């Protein structure tokens, strides 16, 4: 019973930091998922602008 | 020093109270004593120990209400009639000098406000009136408007209570500026700026705004002003040029009667921009029910051709000059919902597109302005109401509405219809397809950003027995099918409308015009079938006319040069159709480039 | 008539294809078309989990000159990745096994990019291009994982160089210098949707007064 | 003790899965950070090359006249 109480205390702390790790994993996953849309859009907007500029430059050069 | 001014002020004021307690000599004595006392009061300074409080001269004057009692003592002398418009101008100049010259904000006090309110009632006597009195009254009202604009909490303090229960209140600062809105020159302009300042102050007060919208006749004055100024306009447009399609800046400034209407409409536009929402709705409803329905309702339906041209040009100028959405809602609801002789006004204006003259040009310019407003309801009622049920497509090709011409089938199909006579045999019109791609990019981008506030995308999902595409589509295609007989300036605006309409990003409208692989029900005429018929008729004119390659060279070189200078029946039919052979392949380039740019537009716009 | 506007058709077709690449979401795939040539699409994959985790593979997509009436687009890598379907000397991924026939209006280049990402999450050894990678896959998996880690370090060490194809639009990384890259990162993150965009000048104002779900004009409540 | 060894066995298996999720979360965060650093560095070099090419783009962006039909429609109002 004292040994059982000790390992159940250690077990409850183990699932406590399990819930802490799962909470931090979910918060970082949601933060990266929200961040991914903004970083991808900020890449591809300027990418499409540069594509259109090079596009009209090439289409002007061929005549 | 400020104390000596106190002694000499009680010297004049002691003479004046003696004169009240005991006629022309006494009147002249109190006039020059009044001039001295009020000029000294204009140069009062506050005490340096308490500069936020009133000065000693105001402390002496407002204690026993000097200004109101000397003013009413002169107004009971006003009943004699000797020098009424000289004495009234004298007190006007004096109280204007207090409002402007005095370095203290005098209007926070009660008695001087009551004296000014009594003076405004003294100047409210009916017409006739000398222009100096009106100039002084407008100047005093404008300076008072400036002072109340600097201290906005006193507009309710000038709102004095009704003298009878249930009667209208008397805001003398606003009701006296009401007859002077229609005047020209500097005086009417000063009255308009003073009333605009008052209406800006009444934007932040619900009691004054309800007074103006309910117990003041400002809105019927504005509505009857617009209605009366739409009688002085000429019913004939005297402009010599045949390329004229709408009233330019040089045109409506050249007619002095139209400039007064335009200034009045600018004033109404500013009032709708600025003032209180109850006042705004009152002016909306009164402008509608007192200008558009009783006057412009019958005036558009004037049967004679030149009056129709004048009314359409005036309507296009007015729609081009409103900036506020609230008055634009009034004008567009009048165009879209008011019914005369069991027909819509917009249906009547649609029926004037199919005409043979300058009426067609002003009608195409009017619909150009209507589509350039980028409103939902005009485009809906013209085409999209007929394209929402999606009955023009048969049952198995309804998914093809949402398809996008990615690989240039539509541009190839449009550029295949370029006539063989117009093709370059083995001169800036040979390779300018890049410039049409640029203006198609700005054309689609403008119509995407101006449709971001729209209720539905009209993609075929959200939202006669044989299908019918609407009277706007039938008239526009039939006038496009007669492209050889039309003038060069008629075809310029007609191809201007179809290019501007095809830039709309609605997939129901875009698939009907630009998606060439779509096949429809046999009652429906596509844009491809109409342009195919023009292609056949322009080549039949090519084979039957002998001098055509020489006529193409001279008619082209005129059309570049117009961009750089920026028996009759046979001669007219030759001249129009040779012009049609310069427009039609570059109309075909324009429709091709718009269908190219619709597959290119960014997801980061819509 | 058709041959005079063929460059316009092909070139705007590739422009629309890059737009539809922007349409479809791709995890960790960042694609860019070239400046000088219209048939070259540079890019880089990031492999977020699996055997190729923490791997950064630059690539270049080669578009045929008669798109879409042609073959599948050819995809090569900058550094040959130790994969069963990657050429150990040229870096060409075997894209043509899945897209055997390039059907018009069905296949697109984003499907090629999606297959390029998915080939690192499902290793297939049937009829290979690098046979030693395959026989390391179904026999001795730990040596395969070691060689994946080694090849990932080889690919990572060559990221910062002057790229294989010189181009004004070539993807060129720089070493992390926070003093200017933090300004670059906040210049990412301060941007928003086109709603309330910084173009507050020029009154491009639409109008609407219809209740949504209805087709009658002026049904929106005041 | 036979109960104690089984309870500490499932306790140690709990610690094993905790360590596995620890190293997996560490690898995920490190890759995401390095990937974002690469993306920002690539865009920053890209933008600096764009401002270097702006010395040519300030001359290349000059141009007017639009299409022929739009120029003609705007020139119809010139009497």
Numbering used by the authors:
A (entry chain B): 627 to 689
B (entry chain C): 32 to 53, 62 to 465, 545 to 581, 733 to 835, 914 to 953
C (entry chain D): 66 to 287
D (entry chain A): 627 to 705
Direct quotes from the study:
Cellular cargos move bidirectionally on microtubules by recruiting opposite polarity motors dynein and kinesin. Here we show that kinesin-3 KIF1C acts as both an activator and a processivity factor for dynein, using in vitro reconstitutions of human proteins. Unlike other cargo adapters, HOOKs form a stable assembly with two other accessory factors, FTS and FHIP. We provide a structural model for the autoinhibited FTS–HOOK3–FHIP1B (an FHF complex) and explain how KIF1C relieves it.
